[PDB]
């Protein structure tokens, strides 16, 4: 059985039962919300292509010290920043 | 103003004379009532003259530099979202609203409005003790204009919908790293905690990566013996619980998610994946390598990669940096070769690919480099573009695997014969020793 | 020879000096080859001229895809005419597939062009919707769509709604394709300089059965004598999109090629002297 | 509610699956909240109007707000002679055909809402798939500890689609700037000058000029460039959590993972059902090696 | 007889078959509620010749029409939009103070065109002198002054 | 020693800017607690608490005085329960758990009210949620306003 | 859904090309498939065919068409296994390792059925495990081993020489029923030819590579005269590193 | 009529999960009552009789819909006419193959076990509920183990399907149907098509 | 009230059983209108 | 509960009828009621 003390918890539920009339009860016609994959998409690029790919959108040498986003992490780097990596290595 | 309410005020056209001499054509439509123009189209109710005078008096200030009066300040100041200080949007704020608001704010406290503020202390109030009922909140906009006046929404077509939900069903396809997380991406844990750094967490992995892929001139090697527990996870009941919460964090961060090849979660109840390292062995005997990769590494033989690149490009052919980059990313860090590198390799290796292709029966897979199709992903060609058996392999693992083949020189930079003699006499078991 | 190039020569040369650009041209070519719509348009446009085997038309379609075929201007003109004829004689198929804008008699003002625009006439030749059209990438497809609709609705003539002027093969020239160096093989039908579209129209055997249509009367004769020119260029844009495509490819090639050769030689010699040193 | 929350969870989950980004609970709920309030607005305005259902002949009339509320009932004295039972059923059926008309209206409205919602999701969704690093493999390709295996069959049947121009980036923003370039080019032309004096022209300027909106008038007063939230390039909720407390980090990443898994399971169920409907799949497992042999 | 089965397909009237249409979900919920709703509407109204057609066919007692139409201005995403930038999204972004951002961007631009071509020759240099890398901008000092 | 705080999803710093303040300022009646409560993934008591704080912060920000009747309005059920409890057990304060009735309801106890709610209908949305639907008899109105000697 | 889709079928996207007729024929084939699956579940014995590590839905690259390999896998080998199961139940050999069946049935005429089936089962297995689809380049250590034996004063002469000796051994087995192995005697390498129904484990060698010289292996592709071409291709598709780790495990 | 139809609707729209255990036969509106629950289990004894043109009336209970789904036309073309015209019983196997329901069980007194299983359960959070219900379903009502196609009770067993589609599929009358039938009765015992 | 429909409730589960063995479980108008009550009062229960 | 995949299919049972879950005739799309999360943070607490 349900204790008298705990019944308040049901209130919001019971509340939006009452309030579900009209548009809130309405679902978009045709659309289930479950969208299955159909095609296969890969936008990956060779490194030399993405070296200057985002220069106009952002600054040049956008992928510079990025290890995950480049196959060559050290390209585009100016000498100093290249030296930094070894500097912390030794 | 796009709207039903957005019609203007009463405006003059002159006497009969000027009206007949103004209009050329006049077409009439049936009588309907007069809607009073809304508050923002009404010139006498909206006059901002005071505020515009304030803008103009401060206008020469707006033409000078911005300069911090703390010198050595660079980073911008953050303005957060929803703070009243920063709200620039006036939806219904007319001169009318700004004045109703002004007055309410003034009778709240006057001492906010004084150039030199006097003491502000609360006194009694004339409406009652409950006077706030008749006072509070912000001035309210008339509800007619709230409801009706809004712009006409630009109709969205079905075309753009179908495009959006196409993009919606593109992103719901699986990414190859998520089901079984590579040991390579699970070394990346960093916490701000004072107990996380003392124990190098991913140290054995990181050591492996360094030793295999990096020159010995530049590499930092973590030693487990000096690390807190011996670089290990302590036995169960011993560590006071340091070890247990260590294990909890690790097992929670390293767990996979999404659906596997059998169509189920890694944690699913009755059905299991990687039974007795059945996938581990499946990688053992297969290995990740292209046929094209080893044909190249066979024909090139000993001679310098860079030399080859200057050769295979006459002066006017292509940028050397480009095919150098693409070559490096293809050989180690195994990737699909760019159609640059594929064109070069095609006119370079043509006799080895011919010889590899010369015996094959009709219905069996050949080896071909033709980029006639736009995309490079070698799941797209049937794996027949390069010699690849895989759709995708994560770079780090590929590099470790092919470097476990001894062909290239990384720690062999030394003098040649000394390198080989160390390899022979110390064996590969020289690194059994951690000292 | 370093001067005269075909499209194939350009793509195989450029394949070395631009990875991404060629990758794009080729992806686009593929996607255009996949459309049933562009195919049906090409086919049903060029059928009357040959009048014959759909085998030859299909072949010419596939060859058109690669730049290996551009239509001769003569063939172009009589194809346009053939279109006006086939769309007028039975209106049902070609007003439900090829689109004309229809007059709104709900709106009436006084002008000689705008009245023939107002009642019972064909206002404009309508291009394919952005979903069924030539390829655009799916980054921008949404904004492309919005723009197309915003512009058609409010009667803005500009951007993706306006059709670029396409070139054809000159009457005296027997060449099959576009070339990088030769510009006189390609002929544009402009407003001012015309290719004899009028004199070919009036002297055609279809002139009177087309003169019958009250709706076409506005697109034949407009204050802008550019109604015929616009109808023409629009028609061959919506039917054969890839002529402009390749034309722009070669345009771009001839523009950017020599900077690229300079970069190539400079860098290669860089690693060259660096290497021998 | 359901259709929305499914798509939003799709987005959140995918956001963490493909890149290491987490969406803030705050954000996730505020999306849904915006859908909800949209529906609410449509309700507010829907109650100002009435729908009339009518039963037999015209002799039973029922006037009802589209939400299904009943305002008036008109009846022929013919009806008064029937039976209490049949009177009830008659009025009830009129009420039903009223609710029908209303519900047709509302369902168009809802389609409209769904479209606005999608349009609002688009900078996020197209935020995650429009990057130079994003990729997918076919769902039928085996996955092993190193990487993903190649699907063998029909080497023609696998086509990799690409959403991004591989040469220098052309972003949606450049397209909007192109659109206003063409707007100005059209306007400033002589033929455009004459067009701006037409009714079409002033309709265009009333709807799509924000710049001319008088101070204090509702709506945006500038034209906005399309939002750019590139997913791998923008740190969202994971960096704040990682700085503050690891525990909340682990919990939120766990939530995202769970949601993603759930979504994927749903997609598998729909796939299975569509496979059974067309008879390629049986109604109970007939192939157990596809499961037990891993 | 075939004509009789043709008759079966016609929708239910009350003139022929003397039965109201079924529509089921409304009957399921609201069947017991109807007395309530009706008396809330102040009872029915018995009028005369509602659906009864006149001599020449005109409606006697002209019928009630629905005002309902789909409201077209109601997008909520433009109602509550971003507090400073006017964008219509639901996306919460913490921006930077305008004028912080301007200054910031300016000094970056200066610093980077200082590092990458220091001599103003105009071409990008990835091997910059130690003086240009660790060197402070004189524009900062000039701004203080 | 103060460094960690539970529930990191909603930070006090981020709730300083109140949500949709540019709307419910201008017609606070069209904005019942429900519309805003869909914004937070928390339980009922917490989200109403937060809404109260939003209103107050907003008011102090706009330099006007806040509605002090608002906490009573959002919590109205809790208000009246406390009033009637105070009259029942004779005490002044807020009723706590120990003093609740020990009645055990059946499983389906809520059915009558459930079908009453599920079948309700409303002319406009204001009728749907007005603040005063909690009150029917005169006793209700006498308990709800006992505080303001004005009302 | 994987469990519900029958064994052969591929699960893909609807292109809506299906006329209702063939759409029904498909459902009927699926029903039949369910029935035959129910009977194969009960026909299941102790031993079973090995799961293939690489997708064979298309052929094995540079070596086999789809029909060739699937005539080995789904025709001859599965018959071998049905035989093996029929004759290892109701005998002292019930439920033991593949080994202890091969080894305890060695050299006896009475159990020749069990032994032949067993050894063929092993050979086919090891053959599948000896094929890596795009081939592989032989590892350094193995090359060093082979060179010390076969190599005469030439660079990896041992590779051309080993892939020669394998050809010769294959051509010198006339009956075209059997196997060719590269094996480790435990004191040296050699290329041995096993007749059908014989196995390297039975002779207590340690196998490195397997090549299938049955005529049924190369008939559909290379015809009856195509054995040389066949072997030459096999080396394009073989798996060396396996042979290597087996060699190194044998040594220690 | 209205109360039965509305009852069916009630079962269809039930907010919390309503599992209809079907033990024994169903006449028309009973068919409706059992099949439209979102969780509808069939035991071996379950049966569906959609008849009533035999009592001189048109079938009721909404199962008509199930018979007209494009799915049924795919799998068993003609079956719809067979069951609607001829009063004819469908069984568990037939209701499973048509995909009218997902769930089937052979266990004695299932109802007791459901009771006692949901006694041992603890929380009400929908995570918990989802798993408890789901685990119940997978362990019993889905046939993962110990089930075969020979063993499920089926009226339409595959030859019969072929016959039905030869007779009743795609025929534009009852009259066409029976001159077809009449022509089929006439076949010898020796014909290929018999 | 008619003892037509009977029930068995566990903590979290609910059993509704139709009892009319005489007429072969054919529901009357009253009994059906009753079942649509017991079904949704069992189904809209808190603990089921 | 969440880790064991089992029972997650049940959030989505509406998928069992394809042409319906598109049509939205029935208001119950979810396990406990109208949708999967109506009140996630409230309802379950009614159990002691
Ligand atoms: Mg009551």
UniProtKB/TrEMBL annotation, chain A:
The chain holds residues 291 to 380 of 435 of the full protein. This is Small ribosomal subunit protein uS5 C-terminal domain-containing protein. The lineage of its organism: Eukaryota, Discoba, Euglenozoa, Kinetoplastea, Metakinetoplastina. It comes from Trypanosoma brucei brucei (strain 927/4 GUTat10.1).
TrEMBL record, chain B:
Transmembrane segments: none annotated. It comes from the Eukaryota. This is Uncharacterized protein. It comes from Trypanosoma brucei brucei (strain 927/4 GUTat10.1). The lineage of its organism: Eukaryota, Discoba, Euglenozoa, Kinetoplastea, Metakinetoplastina.
TrEMBL record, chain D:
It comes from the Eukaryota. SUPFAM superfamilies: YbaB-like. InterPro entries: YbaB-like_sf (IPR036894). It comes from Trypanosoma brucei gambiense (strain MHOM/CI/86/DAL972). This is Uncharacterized protein.
Automatic annotation (TrEMBL), chain I:
This is Enoyl-CoA hydratase/isomerase domain-containing protein. It comes from Trypanosoma brucei brucei (strain 927/4 GUTat10.1).
């Amino acid at each position: 059985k349900v204790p008298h003390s705990l019944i308040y918890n049901i209130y919001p539920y019971l509340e939006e039962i009452r309030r579900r009339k009209g548009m809130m009860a309405m679902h978009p016609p045709g659309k289930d919300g479950l969208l299955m994959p159909d095609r296969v998409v890969d936008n990956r690029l060779p490194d030399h292509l993405k070296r200057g790919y985002y220069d106009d959108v952002y600054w040049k040498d956008f992928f510079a010290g990025s290890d995950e986003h480049l196959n060559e992490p050290r390209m585009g780097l100016r000498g100093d920043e290249m030296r930094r990596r070894l500097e912390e290595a030794q | 103003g796009g709207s039903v309410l957005d019609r203007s005020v009463a405006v003059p056209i002159g006497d009969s004379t000027q009206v007949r001499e103004l209009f050329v054509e006049t077409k009439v439509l049936g009588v309907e009532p007069l809607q009073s123009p809304p508050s923002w189209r009404t010139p006498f109710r909206n006059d901002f003259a005071e505020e515009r005078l304030k803008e103009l008096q401060r206008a020469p200030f707006k033409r000078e530099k911005y300069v911090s009066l703390i010198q050595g300040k660079y980073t911008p100041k953050v303005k957060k979202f929803g703070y009243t200080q920063h709200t620039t949007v006036d939806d219904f704020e007319t001169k009318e609203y700004k004045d109703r608001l002004l007055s309410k704010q003034f009778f709240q406290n006057p001492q906010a409005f004084e150039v030199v503020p006097d003491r502000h202390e609360r006194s009694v109030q004339f409406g009652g003790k409950w006077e706030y009922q008749r006072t509070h909140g912000l001035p309210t906009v008339d509800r007619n204009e709230l409801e009706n006046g809004w712009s006409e929404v630009e109709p969205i077509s079905d075309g753009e919908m179908k495009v959006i939900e196409q993009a919606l069903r593109d992103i719901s396809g699986p990414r190859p790293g998520n089901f079984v997380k590579p040991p390579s991406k699970t070394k990346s844990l960093q916490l701000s905690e004072s107990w996380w750094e003392p124990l190098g967490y991913g140290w054995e992995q990181h050591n492996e990566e360094q030793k295999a892929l990096c020159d010995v001139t530049e590499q930092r090697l973590i030693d487990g013996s000096n690390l807190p527990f011996g670089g290990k996870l302590p036995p169960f009941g011993t560590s006071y619980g340091m070890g247990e919460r260590m294990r909890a964090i690790i097992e929670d961060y390293s767990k996979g998610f999404g659906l596997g090849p059998h169509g189920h979660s890694p944690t699913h109840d009755t059905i299991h994946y990687n039974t007795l390292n059945a996938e581990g062995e499946r990688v053992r005997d297969l290995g990740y390598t292209d046929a094209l990769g080893r044909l190249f590494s066979e024909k090139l033989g000993d001679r310098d990669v860079h030399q080859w690149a200057v050769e295979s490009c006459a002066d006017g052919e292509a940028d050397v940096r480009q095919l150098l980059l693409s070559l490096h990313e293809w050989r180690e860090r195994g990737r699909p070769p760019s159609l640059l590198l594929a064109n070069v390799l095609s006119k370079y290796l043509e006799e080895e690919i011919a010889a590899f292709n010369k015996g094959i029966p009709e219905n069996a897979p050949k080896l071909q480099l033709e980029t006639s199709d736009g995309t490079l992903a070698h799941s797209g060609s049937g794996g027949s573009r390069s010699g690849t058996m895989w759709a995708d392999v994560d770079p780090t693992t590929f590099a470790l695997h092919q470097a476990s083949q001894s062909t290239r020189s990384t720690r062999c930079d030394e003098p040649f014969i000394l390198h080989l003699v160390k390899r022979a006499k110390l064996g590969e078991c020289v690194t059994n020793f951690t000292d | 020879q370093n001067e005269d190039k075909m499209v194939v020569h350009v793509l195989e040369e450029l394949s070395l000096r631009n990875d991404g650009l060629v990758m794009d041209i080729q992806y686009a070519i593929r996607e255009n080859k996949k459309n049933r719509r562009l195919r049906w348009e090409f086919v049903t446009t060029l059928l009357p001229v040959f009048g014959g085997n759909e085998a030859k038309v299909e072949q010419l379609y596939s060859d058109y895809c690669d730049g290996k075929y551009v239509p001769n201007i003569t063939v172009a003109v009589e194809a346009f005419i053939a279109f006006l004829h086939n769309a007028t004689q039975h209106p049902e198929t070609y007003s439900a597939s090829d689109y004309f804008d229809i007059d709104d008699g709900k709106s009436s003002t006084a002008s000689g062009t705008g009245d023939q625009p107002s009642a019972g006439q064909y206002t404009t030749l309508k291009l394919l919707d952005p979903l069924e059209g030539p390829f655009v990438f799916d980054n921008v497809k949404v904004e492309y769509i919005q723009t197309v609709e915003r512009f058609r609705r409010h009667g803005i003539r500009a951007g993706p709604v306006m059709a670029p002027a396409t070139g054809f093969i000159a009457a005296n020239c027997k060449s099959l394709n576009y070339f990088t160096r030769r510009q006189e093989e390609v002929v544009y039908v402009t407003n001012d300089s015309d290719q004899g579209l009028r004199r070919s129209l009036e002297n055609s055997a279809y002139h009177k059965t087309i003169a019958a249509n009250p709706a076409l009367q506005y697109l034949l004769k407009a204050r802008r004598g550019a109604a015929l020119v616009e109808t023409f260029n629009r028609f061959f844009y919506r039917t054969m999109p890839m002529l402009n495509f390749y034309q722009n490819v070669l345009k771009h090639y001839s523009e950017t090629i020599q900077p690229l050769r300079q970069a190539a030689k400079s860098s290669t010699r860089g690693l060259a002297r660096a290497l021998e040193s | 509610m359901e259709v929305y929350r499914r798509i939003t969870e799709r987005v959140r989950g995918a956001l963490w699956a493909h890149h290491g980004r987490l969406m803030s609970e705050r954000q996730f709920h505020r999306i849904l909240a915006f859908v909800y309030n949209n529906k609410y607005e449509y309700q507010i305005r829907f109650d100002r109007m009435e729908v009339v259902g009518r039963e037999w002949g015209g002799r039973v009339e029922v006037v009802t707000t589209p939400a299904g509320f009943l305002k008036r009932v008109r009846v022929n004295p013919c009806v008064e002679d029937l039976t209490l039972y049949q009177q009830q059923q008659l009025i009830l059926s009129a009420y039903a055909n009223a609710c029908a008309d209303g519900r047709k209206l509302m369902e168009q409205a809802e389609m409209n809402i769904y479209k606005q919602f999608l349009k609002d999701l688009k900078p996020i969704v197209m935020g995650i798939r429009d990057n130079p690093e994003f990729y997918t493999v076919s769902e039928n390709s085996i996955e092993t500890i190193g990487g993903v295996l190649q699907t063998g069959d029909s080497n023609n049947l696998c086509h990799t689609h690409r959403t991004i121009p591989a040469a220098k980036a052309r972003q949606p923003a450049d397209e909007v700037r192109a659109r206003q370039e063409w707007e100005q080019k059209w306007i400033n032309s002589p033929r455009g000058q004459s067009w701006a004096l037409t009714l079409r022209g002033k309709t265009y300027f009333a709807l799509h000029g924000p710049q001319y909106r008088p101070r204090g008038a509702p709506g945006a007063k500038k034209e906005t460039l399309p939002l750019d939230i590139p997913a791998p390039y923008t740190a969202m909720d994971e960096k704040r959590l990682l700085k503050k407390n690891w525990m909340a980090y682990l919990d939120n990443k766990h939530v995202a993972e769970v949601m993603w898994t759930r979504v994927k399971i749903a997609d598998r169920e729909k796939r299975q059902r569509l496979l059974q409907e067309t008879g390629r799949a049986w109604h109970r497992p007939i192939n157990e090696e596809a499961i037990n042999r891993w | 007889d075939d004509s009789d089965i043709l008759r079966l397909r016609a929708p239910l009237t009350y003139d022929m078959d003397s039965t109201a249409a079924l529509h089921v979900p409304t009957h399921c919920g609201k069947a017991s509620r109807l007395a309530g709703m009706l008396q809330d509407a102040g009872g029915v109204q018995v009028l005369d010749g509602l659906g009864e057609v006149d001599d020449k066919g005109e409606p006697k007692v002209p019928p009630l029409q629905s005002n309902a139409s789909v409201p077209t201005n109601v997008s909520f995403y433009e109602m509550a939009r971003h507090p400073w930038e006017d964008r219509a999204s639901s996306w919460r972004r913490d921006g930077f103070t305008e004028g912080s951002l301007e200054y910031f961007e300016s000094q970056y631009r200066s610093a980077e065109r200082a590092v990458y071509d220091e001599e103003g020759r105009g071409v990008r240099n990835y091997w910059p002198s130690r003086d240009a890398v660790e060197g402070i901008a004189q524009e900062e000092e000039n701004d203080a002054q | 020693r103060l460094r960690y705080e539970i529930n990191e999803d909603y930070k006090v710093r981020d709730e300083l800017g109140p949500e949709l303040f540019a709307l419910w300022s201008k017609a606070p009646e069209r904005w019942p607690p429900e519309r805003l409560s869909k914004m937070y993934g928390l339980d009922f008591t917490l989200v109403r608490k937060i809404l109260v704080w939003h209103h107050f912060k907003a008011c102090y920000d706009a330099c006007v005085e806040p509605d002090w009747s608002l906490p009573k309005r959002l919590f109205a059920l809790e208000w009246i329960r406390d009033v009637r409890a105070r009259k029942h057990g004779l005490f002044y304060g807020k009723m706590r758990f120990a003093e609740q009735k020990i009645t055990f309801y059946s499983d389906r106890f809520l059915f009558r009210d459930l079908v009453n709610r599920r079948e309700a209908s409303y002319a406009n949305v204001w009728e749907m949620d007005d603040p005063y639907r909690f009150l029917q008899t005169e006793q209700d109105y006498e308990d709800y306003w006992g505080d303001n000697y004005d009302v | 859904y994987h469990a519900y889709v029958p064994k052969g079928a591929s699960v893909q996207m609807g292109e809506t090309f299906m006329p209702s007729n063939i759409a029904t024929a498909v459902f009927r084939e699926t029903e039949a498939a369910a029935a035959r699956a129910d009977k194969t579940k009960e026909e299941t014995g102790f031993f079973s065919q090995p799961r293939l590590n690489y997708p064979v839905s298309s052929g094995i690259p540079a070596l086999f068409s789809k029909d060739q390999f699937d005539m080995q896998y789904s025709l001859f080998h599965r018959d071998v296994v049905e035989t093996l199961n029929r004759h290892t139940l109701g005998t002292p050999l019930e439920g033991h390792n593949l080994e202890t069946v091969i080894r305890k049935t060695s050299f006896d005429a009475t159990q020749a059925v069990a032994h032949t089936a067993a050894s063929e089962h092993f050979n086919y297995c090891f053959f599948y495990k000896s094929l890596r689809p795009w081939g592989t380049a032989p590892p350094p250590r193995l090359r060093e081993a082979l060179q010390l034996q076969y190599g005469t004063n030439g660079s990896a002469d041992a590779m051309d020489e080993v892939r020669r000796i394998v050809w010769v051994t294959a051509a010198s087995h006339q009956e075209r029923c059997g196997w060719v192995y590269l094996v480790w005697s435990g004191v040296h390498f050699d290329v041995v030819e096993f007749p059908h129904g014989s196995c390297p484990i039975a002779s207590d060698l340690i196998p490195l590579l397997a090549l299938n010289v049955h005529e049924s292996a190369y008939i559909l592709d290379y015809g009856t005269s195509g054995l040389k071409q066949y072997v030459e291709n096999y080396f394009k598709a073989c798996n060396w590193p396996l042979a290597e780790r087996y060699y190194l495990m044998a040594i220690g | 009529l209205r109360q039965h139809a509305s009852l069916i609707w009630r079962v269809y729209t039930a907010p919390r999960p309503l599992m209809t255990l079907t033990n024994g036969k169903c006449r028309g509106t009973g068919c409706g009552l059992s099949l439209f629950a979102k969780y509808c289990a069939l035991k071996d004894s379950s049966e569906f009789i959609f008849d009533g043109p035999n009592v001189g009336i048109t079938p009721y209970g909404g199962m008509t819909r199930l018979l007209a789904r494009p799915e049924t036309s795919l799998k068993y073309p003609g079956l719809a006419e067979f069951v609607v015209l001829t009063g004819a019983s469908l069984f568990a196997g037939d209701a499973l193959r048509l995909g009218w329901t997902d769930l089937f069980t052979t266990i004695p007194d299932m109802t007791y076990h459901i009771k006692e299983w949901f006694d041992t359960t603890e929380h009400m959070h929908n995570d918990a509920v989802a798993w408890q219900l789901g685990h119940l379903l997978e362990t019993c009502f889905k046939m993962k183990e110990s089930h075969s196609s020979a063993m499920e009770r089926a009226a339409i067993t595959p030859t019969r399907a072929r016959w039905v589609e030869d007779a009743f599929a795609d025929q534009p009358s009852v009259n066409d149907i029976m001159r077809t039938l009449t022509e089929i009765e006439q076949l010898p015992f020796q014909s290929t098509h018999n | 009230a008619n003892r037509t429909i009977t029930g068995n409730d566990g903590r979290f589960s609910k059993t509704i059983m139709i009892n009319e063995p005489q007429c072969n479980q054919a529901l009357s108008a009253k009994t059906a209108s009753e079942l649509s009550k017991e079904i949704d009062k069992a189904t809209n229960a808190v603990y089921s | 509960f969440v880790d064991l995949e089992t029972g997650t299919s049940l959030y989505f049972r509406d998928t069992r009828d394809s042409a319906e879950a598109i049509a939205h005739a029935a208001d119950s799309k979810g396990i406990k009621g109208m949708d999967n999360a109506i009140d996630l943070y409230n309802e379950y607490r009614i159990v002691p």
